[PDB]
């Protein structure tokens, strides 16, 4: 009983060329160039999913510290204040309040100010 | 494989790969690697199991109710239509596969062509064929010889 390659190999290749659509030049036409590209692609994403946490950990901090200093105080103090008062709210992201809903930020500012001193 | 032995090319400063003869399995057309040769597939199953199985098969088809001994083969005279008539009387409506065991050469000739029937000599009784069929039916002269092999 001989089991020639048959369809098996084509389908496995074809299945990867899909995955690699849109890649530059040979990386999307050649199975071998494709697989190589996809290898790194998987790792790049996995590493970037951990990154995306930090990409915003930051963005928010700037944006916060930004509006934060309009009120005369700085982020590193603002957090000392909030954290001092036990105001565990405003998970950094929600301190988008600095943007829309400014008054509430101004509120949280005084609260943190009163807490610190 | 039918090729020569000559070393296809010198293997040095040729620049080509490196090879011996076309016969080598890396070449297409070359010889097969661990491809199959003819071999014996049989083995000697312990006799005591050849028995137990046979008995157990006949038993299974009895505990099931499907077994039926007979002798009143009036449908003698090797002619399918006759055995076909005897079949109905005996409740073998041809609804289920049957392993008809009998010493009778004619009754054999009769039932032979029915697609739902498996004629068979008494000595030929065996596990596979029993299990294949849905119902065992055999003449009493047969049930003596099966009872003889083991019983």
């Amino acid at each position: 009983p001989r089991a020639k390659t048959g369809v098996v190999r084509r389908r496995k290749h074809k299945k990867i060329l899909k995955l690699a659509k849109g890649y530059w030049g040979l990386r999307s036409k050649s199975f071998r160039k494709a697989r190589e590209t996809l290898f790194a692609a998987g790792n790049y994403a996995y590493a970037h999913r951990k990154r995306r946490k930090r990409d915003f950990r930051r963005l928010w901090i700037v944006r916060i510290n930004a509006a934060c200093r309009q009120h005369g105080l700085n982020y590193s103090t603002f957090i000392h204040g909030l954290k001092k008062a036990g105001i565990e709210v405003d998970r950094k992201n929600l301190a988008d309040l600095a943007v829309r809903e400014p008054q509430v930020f101004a509120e949280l500012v005084e609260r943190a100010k009163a807490a610190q001193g | 494989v039918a090729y020569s032995g000559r070393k296809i090319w010198p293997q040095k400063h040729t620049g080509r790969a490196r090879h011996g003869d076309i016969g080598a399995p890396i070449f297409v057309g070359g010889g097969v690697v661990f491809g199959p040769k003819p071999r014996d597939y049989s083995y000697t199953l312990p006799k005591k199991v050849r028995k137990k199985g046979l008995a157990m098969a006949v038993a299974d088809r009895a505990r099931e109710g499907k077994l039926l001994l007979v002798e009143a083969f009036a449908g003698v005279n090797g002619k399918t239509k006759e055995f076909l008539a005897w079949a109905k009387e005996a409740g073998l409506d041809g609804s289920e596969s049957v392993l008809l065991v009998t010493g009778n050469e004619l009754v054999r000739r009769a039932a032979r062509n029915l697609p739902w029937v498996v004629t068979l000599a008494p000595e030929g009784l065996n596990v596979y064929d029993i299990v294949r069929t849905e119902r065992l039916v055999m003449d009493l002269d047969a049930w003596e010889v099966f009872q003889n092999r083991i019983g």
Partner: protein, 137 residues
């Protein structure tokens, strides 16, 4: 899902120059070229205020920087390395010395280069009195 600003509006600004420590001042200017002070900060769009400096020909600087500090400049050719000292920068093109700093403090990419274009430095003042000009400090 985090906020994202719309088409902003170029806030302009007017900075002095006299007496300001070159680098110290240069920092503040940069942070203004980027948002970083505007709470709707967006690192891929550029919306930092336009900056306009004047009287740059008066910038302070500590140490002996006026003779010590020298600016290098490579041309493709052999020996093409030029060594121009601070003293000579101000003596000739003086707005130059303020640029070589802030530019060196902006990001590197294509956007960073756009930001540099949002900077206007003069020795004067007498800058082109377009519109906005809220002097700062």
């Amino acid at each position: 899902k985090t906020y994202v600003p719309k088409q902003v509006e170029p806030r302009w600004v007017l900075i002095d120059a006299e007496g300001k420590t070159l680098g110290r001042l240069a920092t503040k200017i940069a942070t203004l070229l980027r948002g970083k002070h505007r709470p709707d900060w967006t690192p891929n769009v550029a919306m930092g205020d336009f900056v306009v400096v004047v009287n740059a020909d008066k910038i302070r600087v500590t140490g002996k920087k006026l003779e010590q500090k020298i600016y290098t400049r490579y041309s493709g050719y052999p020996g093409g390395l030029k060594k121009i000292p601070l003293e000579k920068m101000l003596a000739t093109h003086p707005e130059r010395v303020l640029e070589h700093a802030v530019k060196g403090m902006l990001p590197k990419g294509p956007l960073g280069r756009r930001l540099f274009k949002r900077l206007k430095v003069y020795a004067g003042p007498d800058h082109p009195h377009q519109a906005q000009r809220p002097e700062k400090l």
